[PDB]
Structures are given as C-alpha cells and as structure tokens.
Design an enzyme around this catalytic site. Structure first.
Site, PDB file in Angstrom:
ATOM      1  N   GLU A 180     172.679 -16.938  97.345  1.00  0.00           N
ATOM      2  CA  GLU A 180     173.431 -18.386  97.285  1.00  0.00           C
ATOM      3  C   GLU A 180     173.576 -18.760  98.589  1.00  0.00           C
ATOM      4  O   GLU A 180     173.904 -18.745  99.318  1.00  0.00           O
ATOM      5  CB  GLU A 180     174.628 -18.276  96.417  1.00  0.00           C
ATOM      6  CG  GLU A 180     174.549 -19.817  96.131  1.00  0.00           C
ATOM      7  CD  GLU A 180     175.990 -19.553  94.438  1.00  0.00           C
ATOM      8  OE1 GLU A 180     175.227 -19.159  93.881  1.00  0.00           O
ATOM      9  OE2 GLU A 180     176.501 -21.004  94.777  1.00  0.00           O
ATOM     10  N   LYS A 234     184.479   0.887  98.528  1.00  0.00           N
ATOM     11  CA  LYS A 234     184.267   0.274  99.907  1.00  0.00           C
ATOM     12  C   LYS A 234     184.992   0.494 100.765  1.00  0.00           C
ATOM     13  O   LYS A 234     184.769   0.543 102.009  1.00  0.00           O
ATOM     14  CB  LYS A 234     184.817  -1.426 100.072  1.00  0.00           C
ATOM     15  CG  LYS A 234     186.566  -1.933 100.034  1.00  0.00           C
ATOM     16  CD  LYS A 234     186.370  -3.438  99.225  1.00  0.00           C
ATOM     17  CE  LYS A 234     187.615  -4.067 100.326  1.00  0.00           C
ATOM     18  NZ  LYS A 234     187.461  -3.715 101.586  1.00  0.00           N
ATOM     19  N   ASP A 292     175.324  -0.999 101.172  1.00  0.00           N
ATOM     20  CA  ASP A 292     175.252  -2.693 100.817  1.00  0.00           C
ATOM     21  C   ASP A 292     176.356  -3.017 100.637  1.00  0.00           C
ATOM     22  O   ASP A 292     177.453  -2.657 100.924  1.00  0.00           O
ATOM     23  CB  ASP A 292     175.132  -2.223  99.176  1.00  0.00           C
ATOM     24  CG  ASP A 292     173.946  -3.371  98.391  1.00  0.00           C
ATOM     25  OD1 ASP A 292     173.966  -4.364  98.933  1.00  0.00           O
ATOM     26  OD2 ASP A 292     174.299  -3.531  97.330  1.00  0.00           O
ATOM     27  N   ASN A 293     176.506  -4.538 100.669  1.00  0.00           N
ATOM     28  CA  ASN A 293     177.455  -5.279 100.575  1.00  0.00           C
ATOM     29  C   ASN A 293     178.480  -5.017 101.826  1.00  0.00           C
ATOM     30  O   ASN A 293     179.521  -4.881 101.811  1.00  0.00           O
ATOM     31  CB  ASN A 293     178.593  -5.343  99.365  1.00  0.00           C
ATOM     32  CG  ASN A 293     177.777  -4.711  97.948  1.00  0.00           C
ATOM     33  OD1 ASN A 293     177.064  -4.287  97.798  1.00  0.00           O
ATOM     34  ND2 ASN A 293     177.806  -6.091  97.435  1.00  0.00           N
ATOM     35  N   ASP A 350     176.567   2.222  97.792  1.00  0.00           N
ATOM     36  CA  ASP A 350     177.036   1.174  97.453  1.00  0.00           C
ATOM     37  C   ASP A 350     178.427   1.304  96.146  1.00  0.00           C
ATOM     38  O   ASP A 350     178.478   0.776  94.834  1.00  0.00           O
ATOM     39  CB  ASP A 350     175.886   0.462  96.332  1.00  0.00           C
ATOM     40  CG  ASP A 350     175.344  -0.940  95.390  1.00  0.00           C
ATOM     41  OD1 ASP A 350     176.420  -1.475  96.704  1.00  0.00           O
ATOM     42  OD2 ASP A 350     174.829  -1.252  95.125  1.00  0.00           O
TER      43      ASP A 350
HETATM   44  C1  6PQ Z   1     183.976  -2.129  92.668  1.00  0.00           C
HETATM   45  O1  6PQ Z   1     184.180  -1.091  91.662  1.00  0.00           O
HETATM   46  C2  6PQ Z   1     182.983  -0.376  91.802  1.00  0.00           C
HETATM   47  C3  6PQ Z   1     182.243  -0.596  92.867  1.00  0.00           C
HETATM   48  C4  6PQ Z   1     180.967   1.334  92.439  1.00  0.00           C
HETATM   49  C5  6PQ Z   1     181.256   0.869  91.349  1.00  0.00           C
HETATM   50  C6  6PQ Z   1     180.330   2.295  90.930  1.00  0.00           C
HETATM   51  C7  6PQ Z   1     180.539   3.160  91.197  1.00  0.00           C
HETATM   52  C8  6PQ Z   1     181.229   4.143  92.208  1.00  0.00           C
HETATM   53  C9  6PQ Z   1     181.207   5.513  91.964  1.00  0.00           C
HETATM   54  C10 6PQ Z   1     181.680   5.963  93.222  1.00  0.00           C
HETATM   55  S1  6PQ Z   1     183.658   6.027  93.765  1.00  0.00           S
HETATM   56  C11 6PQ Z   1     183.550   7.700  94.304  1.00  0.00           C
HETATM   57  C12 6PQ Z   1     184.795   7.839  95.139  1.00  0.00           C
HETATM   58  N1  6PQ Z   1     182.102   8.068  94.260  1.00  0.00           N
HETATM   59  C13 6PQ Z   1     181.812   7.841  93.775  1.00  0.00           C
HETATM   60  C14 6PQ Z   1     180.308   8.160  93.141  1.00  0.00           C
HETATM   61  N2  6PQ Z   1     180.208   5.253  91.216  1.00  0.00           N
HETATM   62  N3  6PQ Z   1     179.595   4.460  90.711  1.00  0.00           N
HETATM   63  C15 6PQ Z   1     182.202   1.051  90.808  1.00  0.00           C
HETATM   64  C16 6PQ Z   1     183.132   0.318  91.045  1.00  0.00           C
HETATM   65  K     K Z   2     175.950  -3.481  94.798  1.00  0.00           K
END
Ligand code: 6PQ
Ligand code: K
Ligand code: K
Ligand code: K
Length: 217
Positions: free
Chosen positions: A198, A143, A168-169, A140
């Site tokens: 929705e 993307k 997810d998504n 999650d």
């Molecule tokens: C729409 O943008 C977002 C989508 C999901 C998140 C939550 C999130 C994603 C991450 C990432 S990214 C990556 C290369 N490694 C990690 C562990 N950590 N937390 C934040 C922003």
């Molecule tokens: K999500």
C-alpha cells in the site's frame, strides 16, 4: 461447519481447470478478492518469488509455512523436471487442504507435505526424507522462529554454499533479529526486495540471503 480453507478448496475444485496450476492460482486469487481475505503471499511478492526460482533453478526447495498450498502451487509450477518441494505446515487441517490443492493442480508428484513443527522436522530431514542439502528455503512461518530455524538448518548441515534463503515479511511486521544476523554474518550475502502493498504506509519486503558455506583457513 465449514472452515474457510475448505471453502477456498471447494471454490478451486469448482472453477479451476484441472491440472493447470495457473488456473488454480487465479481461482484462489479471485475467491480472496470476492470474499475479502488473503493468502500468505500476494501478487507482487509472487513475482519476486517467481524471479528467484527462475534465477537459481533449485533442485530441492524447502518451504516453511504452507497454509493452503497457494505458495506451494506458485513455486512448484516453476520447478524443472526432477526438482522437488518439501513444505512444512503445523496445522493438520491446512496441511490436508494443501495436498488436495496440489493434487488438483497436477503438481503433486513434485511436492511432499509434512505436518509438524519446523524445529521437530528440520532435524529428521536427512535421515527420514533423504535430504543431503537444500538448494533453496522459503521462510513464511512464525517470525520468532526464522533466526533459530536458520541456525538449525546450519547445524544440521542442510545448507551448502549457494543455498538461497528467501524470507517473507522481514519488514512488516518485521523479523529484525533474523535480518540483523544474515546482514551481519559472514555466512550470508544478502539482498532486499521490496514489496509495495500500500502506497507510503504498507511497504514490506523479502530478504534473499545466500549461504556462503563454512569458512576455511
Ligand atoms: C502469525 O502466526 C502464523 C504465521 C504463519 C502461519 C503459517 C504456518 C506456520 C507454520 C509453522 S510454525 C512452526 C514452528 N513450524 C511451522 C511449519 N505452519 N504454518 C501460521 C500462523
Ligand atoms: K507471508
Ligand atoms: K539445479
Ligand atoms: K552479510
């Protein structure tokens, strides 16, 4: 200044029953409806997650994208004695929140939190966290990173035959690269679970992709 994750954690600490994950999850759910905001998974998606965890009873789970630990509290409460969750969060502050969140839920001995980017951490998992294989992966995070992190797990040898990826998504906003690959590859056996956010207009879904192991001949 007070960020809004800090405010969610301050609500939990003030209104939830200590050591009770369900109480924690309901405090967060309630703060979100009142202050108009939302975690990374909803209730419908939670129930899909709940079923998967219950069905495959994984001894070691990797979650990519912790945010607040809502999804960590959700998954870790279902873990059997001995099973553990590794969860990755790229934002230092959110990672911190997630730890306090797990502490308050009483699940903190089951979950290790790692602050970093998935493409840096996934290679260190074997050597620095004594991972042999993962039993389940929840994606999650970003993307564009679903498909390459998947092959990164693959190349690192962190998947075994039977490993369950739950993404997810995959529909909204969509992970069409990732979907095409696991649906088309012989290395996965996929199933789609739809989440109705929705009526008619926002219909998302999770993809459950079961690793089938390397081939043989
Ligand atoms: C729409 O943008 C977002 C989508 C999901 C998140 C939550 C999130 C994603 C991450 C990432 S990214 C990556 C290369 N490694 C990690 C562990 N950590 N937390 C934040 C922003
Ligand atoms: K999500
Ligand atoms: K097991
Ligand atoms: K397939």
């Amino acid at each position: 200044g007070d960020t809004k994750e800090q405010r969610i954690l301050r609500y939990v600490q003030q209104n939830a029953k200590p050591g009770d994950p369900q109480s924690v999850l309901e405090a967060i759910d309630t703060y979100c409806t009142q202050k108009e905001w939302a975690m990374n998974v909803g209730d419908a998606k939670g129930q899909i997650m709940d079923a998967v965890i219950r069905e495959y009873s994984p001894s070691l789970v990797l979650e990519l994208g912790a945010y607040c630990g809502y999804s960590a509290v959700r998954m870790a409460r279902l873990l059997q004695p001995g099973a553990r969750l590794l969860t990755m969060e790229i934002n230092p502050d959110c990672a911190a929140i997630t730890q306090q969140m797990l502490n308050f839920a009483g699940l903190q001995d089951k979950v290790t939190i790692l602050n970093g980017a998935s493409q840096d951490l996934i290679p260190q998992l074997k050597k620095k966290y004594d991972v042999d294989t993962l039993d389940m992966v929840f994606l999650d995070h970003w993307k564009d990173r679903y498909l390459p992190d998947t092959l990164l797990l693959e190349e690192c040898g962190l998947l075994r035959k039977g490993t369950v990826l739950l993404a997810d998504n995959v529909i909204v906003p969509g992970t069409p690269d990732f979907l095409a690959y696991v649906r088309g590859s012989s290395s996965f056996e996929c199933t789609h679970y739809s989440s109705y956010l929705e009526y008619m207009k926002v219909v998302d879904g999770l993809e459950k992709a079961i690793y089938q192991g390397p081939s043989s001949d």
